[PDB]
Write an enzyme that holds these catalytic residues in place. Structure first.
Site, PDB file in Angstrom:
ATOM      1  N   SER A  43      72.424 -94.541 -85.941  1.00 55.90           N
ATOM      2  CA  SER A  43      72.932 -94.697 -84.441  1.00 55.90           C
ATOM      3  C   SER A  43      72.345 -95.877 -83.654  1.00 55.90           C
ATOM      4  O   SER A  43      73.039 -96.334 -82.680  1.00 55.90           O
ATOM      5  CB  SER A  43      72.991 -93.967 -83.668  1.00 55.90           C
ATOM      6  OG  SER A  43      74.234 -92.834 -83.988  1.00 55.90           O
ATOM      7  N   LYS A 207      67.524 -96.515 -77.658  1.00 55.59           N
ATOM      8  CA  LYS A 207      68.626 -95.810 -78.324  1.00 55.59           C
ATOM      9  C   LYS A 207      67.924 -95.324 -79.667  1.00 55.59           C
ATOM     10  O   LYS A 207      67.344 -95.996 -80.437  1.00 55.59           O
ATOM     11  CB  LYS A 207      69.616 -97.086 -78.692  1.00 55.59           C
ATOM     12  CG  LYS A 207      70.865 -96.609 -79.560  1.00 55.59           C
ATOM     13  CD  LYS A 207      71.717 -95.753 -78.619  1.00 55.59           C
ATOM     14  CE  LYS A 207      72.646 -94.932 -79.379  1.00 55.59           C
ATOM     15  NZ  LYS A 207      71.964 -93.741 -80.080  1.00 55.59           N
ATOM     16  N   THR A 208      68.442 -94.094 -79.702  1.00 54.64           N
ATOM     17  CA  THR A 208      67.916 -93.410 -81.037  1.00 54.64           C
ATOM     18  C   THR A 208      68.832 -93.680 -82.114  1.00 54.64           C
ATOM     19  O   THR A 208      69.977 -93.901 -81.966  1.00 54.64           O
ATOM     20  CB  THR A 208      67.798 -91.777 -80.704  1.00 54.64           C
ATOM     21  OG1 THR A 208      68.719 -91.445 -80.028  1.00 54.64           O
ATOM     22  CG2 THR A 208      66.607 -91.477 -79.741  1.00 54.64           C
ATOM     23  N   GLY A 209      68.349 -92.975 -83.423  1.00 59.50           N
ATOM     24  CA  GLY A 209      69.288 -92.950 -84.359  1.00 59.50           C
ATOM     25  C   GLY A 209      68.669 -91.786 -85.363  1.00 59.50           C
ATOM     26  O   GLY A 209      67.308 -91.663 -85.598  1.00 59.50           O
TER      27      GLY A 209
END
Length: 261
Positions: A43, A207-209
């Site tokens: 993501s 923003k994480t993923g």
């Protein structure tokens, strides 16, 4: 132990591959660890898609408020915000916010579709001077994260450089840059990642993923109380397909490289 020795030690015990790229904007100095190695973005790629739409809005004053219909068929595997609007509509701005702050996969697909497909997102990245980033698939297949697979990947350094350009640099017009920063600061999914390894008072946008092969990522812009901003990308992936995510590793890496700041 030097920062490099601490990072190598961190990786050795992690059971995976660690990728770190920190840019200290005070002097443009960097702390790199496997920063030129590719990792599946998961993501974190949503930032590029949202930024691409922001770039378009610079020349189209009605774009951000443009209505987008949300059908039941648009829903994929994770749509916390989009599911609340089925049969209704969401503006491109709301889709950008949902994709970035809640990591809504349906939102991401709507942004990609609006832009004309994954190749268009890659084209935007290239326009920013990012010659590494590549988006090949939509949600949810962009999450396979197969070791050695170049699809939907980038390197820690490439993403750190681009995130810096997007949030603090030359990439977007001021109003758009501020909007991206506002969205990132309002993220609700990164408590246990980079944020967990920093002083609680520091302002952070990220923003994480998270995806297959225990791939655990986070890209952030950090604003210390008495220092210039730091841009940090922490990527992590493992050898087994169903490996558990390791956000604790990202937090640990963040603590190591931000030390002193």
């Amino acid at each position: 132990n030097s920062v490099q020795q601490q990072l190598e030690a961190l990786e050795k015990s992690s059971g995976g591959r660690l990728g770190v790229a920190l840019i200290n904007t005070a002097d443009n100095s960097q702390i790199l660890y496997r920063a030129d190695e590719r990792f599946a973005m998961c993501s974190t790629s949503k930032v590029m898609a949202a930024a691409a739409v922001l770039k378009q809005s610079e020349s189209d004053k009605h774009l951000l408020n443009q209505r987008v219909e949300i059908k039941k068929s648009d829903l994929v595997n994770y749509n916390p915000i989009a599911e609340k609007h089925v049969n209704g509509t969401m503006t491109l701005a709301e889709l950008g916010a949902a994709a970035l702050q809640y990591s809504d996969n349906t939102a991401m697909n709507k942004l990609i579709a609006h832009l004309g497909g994954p190749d268009k997102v890659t084209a935007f990245a290239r326009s920013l001077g990012d010659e590494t980033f590549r988006l090949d698939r939509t949600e949810p297949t962009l999450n396979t994260a197969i070791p050695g697979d170049p699809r939907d990947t980038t390197t820690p350094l490439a993403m750190a450089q681009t995130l810096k350009n997007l949030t603090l640099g030359k990439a977007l017009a001021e109003t758009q840059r501020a909007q991206l920063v506002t969205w990132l600061k309002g993220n609700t999914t990164g408590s246990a990642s980079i944020r967990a390894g920093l002083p609680k008072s520091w302002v952070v946008g990220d923003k994480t993923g998270s995806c297959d092969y225990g791939t655990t990522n986070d890209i952030a812009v950090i604003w210390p109380e008495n220092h210039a901003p730091l841009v940090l990308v922490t990527y992590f992936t493992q050898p087994e397909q169903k490996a558990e995510r390791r956000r604790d590793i990202l937090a640990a890496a963040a603590k190591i490289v931000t030390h002193g700041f």
